[PDB]
Amino acid sequence: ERPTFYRQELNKTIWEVPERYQNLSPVGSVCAAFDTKTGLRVAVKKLSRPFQSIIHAKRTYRELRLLKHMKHENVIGLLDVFTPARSLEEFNDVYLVTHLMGADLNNIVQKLTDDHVQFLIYQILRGLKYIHSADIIHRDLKPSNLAVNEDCELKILDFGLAATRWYRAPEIMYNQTVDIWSVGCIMAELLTGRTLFPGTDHIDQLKLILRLVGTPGAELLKKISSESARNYIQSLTQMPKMNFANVFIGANPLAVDLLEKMLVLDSDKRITAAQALAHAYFAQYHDPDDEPVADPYDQSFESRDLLIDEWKSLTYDEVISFVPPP
Numbered sequence: 001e002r003p004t005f006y007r008q009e010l011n012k013t014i015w016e017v018p019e020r021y022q023n024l025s026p027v028g029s030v031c032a033a034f035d036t037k038t039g040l041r042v043a044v045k046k047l048s049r050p051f052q053s054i055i056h057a058k059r060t061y062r063e064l065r066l067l068k069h070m071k072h073e074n075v076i077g078l079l080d081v082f083t084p085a086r087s088l089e090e091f092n093d094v095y096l097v098t099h100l101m102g103a104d105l106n107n108i109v110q111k112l113t114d115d116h117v118q119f120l121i122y123q124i125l126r127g128l129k130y131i132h133s134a135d136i137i138h139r140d141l142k143p144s145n146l147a148v149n150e151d152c153e154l155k156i157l158d159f160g161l162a163a164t165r166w167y168r169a170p171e172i173m174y175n176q177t178v179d180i181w182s183v184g185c186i187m188a189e190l191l192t193g194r195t196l197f198p199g200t201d202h203i204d205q206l207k208l209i210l211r212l213v214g215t216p217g218a219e220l221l222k223k224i225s226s227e228s229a230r231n232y233i234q235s236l237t238q239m240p241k242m243n244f245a246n247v248f249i250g251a252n253p254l255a256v257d258l259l260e261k262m263l264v265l266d267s268d269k270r271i272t273a274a275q276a277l278a279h280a281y282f283a284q285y286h287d288p289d290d291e292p293v294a295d296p297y298d299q300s301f302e303s304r305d306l307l308i309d310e311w312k313s314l315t316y317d318e319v320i321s322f323v324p325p326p
C-alpha cells in the first residue's frame, strides 16, 4: 500500500513527500503544503536530525506519541505521519502532517475587543484542560504556538516538548499552573498591545515580574526552597503588590479579576485551567457538557532512558500502524 514520493532541496534540506501533497513554503522546518487529496491546506513538518543524538531520538518518539494520542478542538492533531524509508534499517526521516491554520496570536497583535480576548483566552484554557487531563505541561506557551484561522478557532501547538523569558512561570525560572502564568501574560497583551514583562536578562525578568505582583511575603519566604532563590529575593528591594486596575485601565472588571488570580506566585493557590473556565469572565462561552477531558496517555515510556536504536524502532511501528482519521 506504499505510494510514490518526490524530492526538493529547500533551506539546505531535502523534503521527500508523497504525490498526495504539493507546493512547500516555510511557515525543525515546517512547510505550507497544499493537499490535492482533500484539497485543503495541511501543515507539513520535517524534523531536525530526528535520531542524531539520544535526546533527539526521545523528543521524536514523545512528539509522535503525544500527537497520535491528543484529540481536542483547541489542540493540534495528527492527520498523517510518513517516512520515505521502505524498511526499518533505512528509516532516518519522519514527517508529521496536521491542519494548517491562518497565523499565530503574535500576528493578531492592535487594540482587541473584550469579547475577542474572551473567545481566545477561553479556547487556550479549554485546550489546557484537555492537555492537563493527560498529565502534560506546555512549559513555553507564547502566542506563537497558539495558531488561529479567520473564524478565531484556536489550536495549541508545541505542548510537552521543550527575548525568550517573557512568558516563563516564576517557580520554574513542577506544577501544571506554569501555563496559567503564560495565559495571563498573553491576555494582558491582547487587552492592550503591550508585553507585561519584556525583560532581556534572566534576573531582570524576575525583577520586572515582582514589580507588578509584589515581593514574596512572609508566608511564601517560608514556603520557598532554594538558597540562591532566597538570597536573591532578600538582595532585591522590598516591593508591594500593585493594583491591577491602575495598569488595566478601562478593562472589563471580570478580566482584571482573572489576571489578579492568574498572575500569583503561589502555585498551590493559583487558579487551574478547569477552574478558570467557570469564572464570571467566560459566562457566555462556558458549557459543562462540551468541555472534554483526555483519554489516558501511556506516559510509561518516560521512566526509560535506553539507546537510540531502540527509540527508532518504537517510532518506526507507530508510523506503520497509524490509521488516518476522517
Ligand SMILES: Cc1ccc(C(=O)NC2CC2)cc1Nc1ncnn2cc(C(=O)c3ccccc3)c(C)c12
Pocket (backbone or CB within 6 Å): 027, 030, 043, 044, 045, 062, 063, 064, 066, 067, 076, 096, 097, 098, 099, 100, 101, 102, 103, 104, 147, 156, 157, 158, 159, 160, 161
Ligand atoms: C505539523 C506540526 C507538527 C507537530 C506539531 C506539534 O505541536 N507537536 C507537538 C508535540 C505536540 C504541530 C504542527 N504544526 C505546526 N507546527 C509549527 N508551526 N506551525 C504553523 C502552523 C500554521 O497553521 C500557521 C500558518 C501560517 C503562519 C503561521 C502559522 C501550524 C499548524 C504549525
